[PDB]
Design a protein around this nucleic acid. Structure first.
Lengths: 252, 455, 455, 252
DNA sequence: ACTAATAGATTAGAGCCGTC
RNA sequence: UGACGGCUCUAAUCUAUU
DNA sequence: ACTAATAGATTAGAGCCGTC
RNA sequence: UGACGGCUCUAAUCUAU
């Protein structure tokens, strides 16, 4: 008795080359926002961290064209992968914290790039689909959007990046609803109330298949997919979860 | 491709030296470790409070065979499974009319009406306990639906808090719960319908009520001697007292000769004032110096190794304070429990989710374990949908993660409060939460009682 | 030529309403008024002291043959008599070592050494009551002989006063009382020889151990409808404090629709400073109103007659206060019980003395009454020497004196501390004596449990 | 049925005509004592409560010859048993209290006149007979004084006047011990211990007969015994107890 | 100095349903 | 508070970067 | 003013004993 | 304090100089 064991994690089978720190001295004011940028980057002290080039940010920041590559700090990612970094300028915990900031930021930018509409939860952002991008309202013979009573339900995912076990994308799947597809019900209680009503009619296998189906459509190739944080370097994430080994099967 | 180590089910011990794996099915065949003769119950409530309780209880002694299941389709009578006789006879009743409770129902101030509701309930209990020659065992408070529907701080927390000074175990019910057929949703069937699960519903009332009165229904069997289990939860206090104040609760799993002692050390520590869940070194020693002595006065020695638990991970500040008040043969070790890693696991075939007990270890310090899932002994899922695996990691000190994972399983099995197959968290935290929940309701409690029957 | 009126023995009830004037025989043939299943008994004492208790709890279990059933009735057994189970099963022990007792016994200062010894027992009893998972109906304290032989205030009075704050029924046994065969006078037979009486000595202990834990053996059937009775004793406290202070205590004996247990409104009034045993009007209103008030919660209307039994003579400055807090349809009466009247009747023929129930009426206000001596029902002498008749005089109020003497026999019927044929002093006075002495041991009592099992 | 009963009470058949008050105003000595007087007289304020005349006490009090009969306040004995007399000078309750006071003093005087040895006590004073006064200490063929082991026990009686039910001599009986009948033992605990030793073999018949015999010996006449309250006036108290007719009876 | 900072990474409440 | 899940919704803290 | 006054009359303590 | 009789031995209070 043994069981093939797939998960809700998503391994990072290839991590970008190195962490590029920008010596953006006096280039950015305190009032600056970076969440509008199409590429994941956050400020640290007087520096800016990313994996792309300086001119990659000049499309929205034409002033930033004066930056030179001679003022860039390069830190290898696989060095942080082993958790072996030790420096007074920035701690390893800060390094790992910086990465998970970028990966979380990078995921939504690709998510907003994809034709999947979003929703604002208590602490994170989900991504629900709509009728209009599907065939016969199904994907890979799996019901990805359904119609129940006078409403319709939508599958959604909420992925966050974690680093303690290993570089992995950690997805959370949950259901969301609309009145006629275009507009959702704007009452949290009823939206939750219908979720349990329809959620309790589901089972393990159907929960897994819909989650895997969304990633497969999200996947760019059959074997894996690449997260387009930048147009040149990318974070590649397998479209198949981190499988495990279950050495005990069901007994009767 | 990562393997998952299976942890064999924690093994609970029963009477006669007999030994069964599951509790509630084991309790069906075999009985409690201790014989309690009868139970001199007491009932307080309205006129209909009796009729719902008398009809329910007089229906509960007979074997209520649960229907349409393989998980637990039986209940072999109360006195048959417990060897203790307790029924409608001996029911001591104090009357709370509808007018006086009604006059306390329509008050705008929720704080005073909650305090007044409990004040009238316990003043009958306190007077009956003291000013009555007939001895009660544990009381069974009945309140109607409109009470908590309109008045509800928390009534349950306030009720238990005020009675700790007098050490009178109680229990609280409602017309919705017991007489589920009486109140009927006019636009359908009764809201809380549990007829299919009615048979093993009675398991839960019949178990805790036993525990509230000298009950020792089942005992652990895999506990190694000389090990101390100190479950330390951090509960917050917010209403009517300062929000940035944190308290503590402490449990025990010592063994004296044979027998697992499960008294909960309370000694509540309101020292954390910064809103953070950490213990100052002043009272950090007060934990063990009180807990270790309780081991000493119970065993005559000091434990060779202590498993201390916490829902929140410790820091180096506490550990220096903890170990400095312990000798050089009682190595401390700090285990933290975390139900906040929303990992989810799936299987290729079957609408059923994953079985229970299969644990995945991340490294020599951390591991994942499934307290709930598709339990096979009942042929149905303990948690119907995919659960959250518990993230148990060792924080301070060193220990074998294999046994710590086993010991965590060796804690979820028993739950005297809940007649369930297995709990989703170690009881050194679950019952720690209830102690913190109740001790924080009232603010004049000094040297509170430690036995769990008072909660 | 003075005529002696005679009143027959008052009737008593038993299980299902039996007609047995005798209490011990009535309990032998018929069980108590209520069933209580088993009694969960805890034990505290010296390690070796437990063994002698383990000797005794089975000696009670088997029937013990006292004497001729006419002389002293046989004892069928706890299970046979009380319909209750009481044996070594369920016994909870708390070890008390001897070395600490000796070092406390070797102090010249009695006051603190007596306080220390009872504290040694108390810290065991208090913690076991709170921090234990075992339900204990009543605790039993076994005290070594050397304690009271050399170091005794009084141990027993100090023990119950402090335990009163926590409401646990306790009973004190001495090694001499139980291990009478073991302890032996080297120059003869054991000093505590009661082999001939051993049959009933078990009964009184058993009846006590019944009333300590939910005991309702019998209820007098002659209680007049809608009437209440008050006892009264004026105890004194010389334990340091002021040079003199006269206390007080009282109980109600009301009636309900069917049977009525009685409790004691004590609420002690240490106000009397002059040392004259009389009640000031300020407190007297509180006592009677509280007794009058407590009647309301049971029947709903004021009692039609209230009787004030007391050992002393009411002063006119006092009895005005009682009437003014009394409604105008519930006439009060005031009777005095005196043992300081050296009158002794004799029988010219026959070597034996007078019988019970025969009263001499000096006048409509005052009369004599005999309650102790050689009763012909069991043809044995309760007092081998000549008795001393009870003096009843209606000091205040007015009622038919025949009724008072007829009713006062009913008070003499029951004394739950010692199941005998009839108490030689009405229950409302002897039970007043102990409740007064117990509460005068300590001056730190705020609200005392109103029942009797705690004394 | 019919049970005769004899109590420990001796009724008085007769009282003298009156009680005499002597006003020793400004003429009594400051150190005046009345205990040494052979007649029962109690002094309080200026009055002297007694029954004898002034010249009776002049034998040791020549200064009382100046007393004159005008200030002899004679209160008739007829008022006491009804309480009719009510005066500011002497309260009605005080007449009863004065009468019982002087009678007990008269009682102890008569025992001293008799050849009976006393046993003083904190509250009372019992009177016991010494062996050899009468043959084998057996009055009216009834045991009165015995020798148990080395200890000898002598019957004793303590009496005090009580008037509340009716004027009656209200007497109590208890045992006293010595070594040879002449030396009292100072061991009161042994005296109590011996008293309990003597009481362990007595019953009703021997309790009443012993008391009944003792008063018979004290009898001055056949059916009563007087008291020397005056040189010519006496109170006659029945030497037989008051009989109680208990018409409810049971077998012995 | 602290200032609110924006995502971390931890933390407890608390309401809401289904189901055993 | 029968009791256990499950999410949803709020709230707070320490870590650095402003 | 009460100083103790010597008794009656009440009351409580603390001893000791028995157990027909 | 097993308990409930019976005495012993102290003591104080109130009612009157």
């Amino acid at each position: 008795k043994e069981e093939i064991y797939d998960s809700n994690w998503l391994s990072i089978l290839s991590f970008p080359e190195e962490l590029r720190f920008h010596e953006y001295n006096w280039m950015l004011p305190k009032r600056f926002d970076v969440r509008e940028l199409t590429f994941p980057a956050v400020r640290y002290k007087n520096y800016l961290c990313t994996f792309a080039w300086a001119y990659d940010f000049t499309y929205h920041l034409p002033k930033t064209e004066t930056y030179h590559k001679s003022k860039t700090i390069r830190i290898p990612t696989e060095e942080i992968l082993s958790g072996s970094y030790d420096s007074n300028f920035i701690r390893n915990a800060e390094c790992k914290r910086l990465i998970v900031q970028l990966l979380n930021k990078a995921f939504e930018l690709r998510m907003k790039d994809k034709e999947v509409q979003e929703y604002e939860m208590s602490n994170k952002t989900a991504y629900w689909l709509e009728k209009g991008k599907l065939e016969k309202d199904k994907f890979e013979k799996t019901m990805l959007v359904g119609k129940q009573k006078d409403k319709n339900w939508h599958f959604a995912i909420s992925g966050a990046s974690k680093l303690y076990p290993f570089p992995v994308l950690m997805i959370s799947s949950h259901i969301f609803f609309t009145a006629d597809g275009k507009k959702l019900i704007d009452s949290s209680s009823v939206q939750h109330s219908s979720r349990r009503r329809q959620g309790k009619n589901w089972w393990n296998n159907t929960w897994r298949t819909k989650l895997l189906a969304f990633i497969k459509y999200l996947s760019d190739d059959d074997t894996s997919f690449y997260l387009e944080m930048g147009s040149e370097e990318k974070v590649f994430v397998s479209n198949e979860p981190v499988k495990f080994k279950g050495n005990v099967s069901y007994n009767i | 491709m990562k393997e998952l180590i299976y942890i064999e089910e924690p093994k609970i011990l029963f009477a006669h030296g007999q030994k069964c794996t599951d509790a509630r099915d084991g309790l069906a065949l075999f009985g409690p470790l201790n014989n309690l003769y009868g139970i001199k119950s007491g009932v307080i409530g309205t006129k209909q409070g009796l009729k719902i309780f008398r009809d329910y209880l007089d229906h509960i002694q007979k074997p209520i065979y649960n229907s349409n299941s393989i998980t637990r389709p039986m209940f072999p009578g109360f006195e048959a499974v417990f060897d203790c006789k307790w029924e409608s006879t001996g029911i001591t009743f104090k009357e709370v009319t509808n007018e006086d409770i009604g006059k306390f129902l329509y008050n705008s101030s929720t704080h005073k009406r909650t305090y007044d509701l409990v004040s009238l309930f316990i003043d009958k209990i306190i007077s009956a306990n003291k000013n009555e020659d007939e001895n009660v065992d544990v009381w069974f408070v009945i309140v109607p639906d409109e009470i908590y529907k309109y008045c509800r701080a928390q009534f349950h927390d306030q009720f238990k808090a005020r009675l700790l000074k007098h050490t009178i175990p109680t229990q609280i019910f409602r017309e919705s719960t017991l007489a589920w057929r009486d109140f009927k949703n006019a636009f359908g069937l009764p809201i809380r319908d549990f007829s299919k699960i009615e048979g093993h519903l009675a398991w839960t009332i019949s178990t805790a009520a036993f525990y509230k009165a000298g009950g020792k229904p089942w005992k652990l069997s895999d506990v190694r001697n000389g090990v101390c289990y100190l479950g330390l939860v951090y509960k917050k206090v917010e209403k009517s007292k300062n929000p940035r104040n944190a308290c503590c609760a402490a449990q025990m799993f010592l063994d004296n000769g044979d027998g697992t002692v499960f008294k909960g050390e309370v000694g509540p520590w309101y020292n954390p004032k910064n809103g953070q869940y950490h213990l100052e070194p002043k009272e950090a020693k007060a934990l063990l110096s009180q807990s270790l002595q309780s081991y000493k006065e119970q065993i005559g020695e000091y434990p060779k190794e202590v498993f201390i638990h916490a829902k929140t991970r410790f820091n180096h500040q506490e550990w220096d304070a903890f170990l400095e008040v312990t000798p050089k043969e009682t190595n401390l070790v700090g285990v933290t429990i975390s139900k906040t890693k929303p990992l989810k696991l799936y299987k290729t075939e079957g609408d059923y989710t994953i079985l229970r007990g299969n644990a995945y270890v991340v490294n020599e310090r951390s591991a994942f374990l499934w307290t709930v899932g598709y339990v096979p002994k009942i042929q149905t899922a303990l948690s119907m949908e995919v659960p959250n695996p518990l993230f148990i990691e060792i924080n301070k000190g060193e220990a074998d993660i294999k046994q710590v994972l086993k010991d965590i399983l060796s804690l979820t099995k028993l739950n005297y409060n809940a007649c369930i197959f297995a709990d989703g968290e170690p009881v050194t935290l679950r019952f720690a939460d209830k102690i913190g929940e109740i001790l924080t309701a009232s603010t004049d409690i000094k040297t509170p009682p430690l036995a769990f029957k008072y909660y």
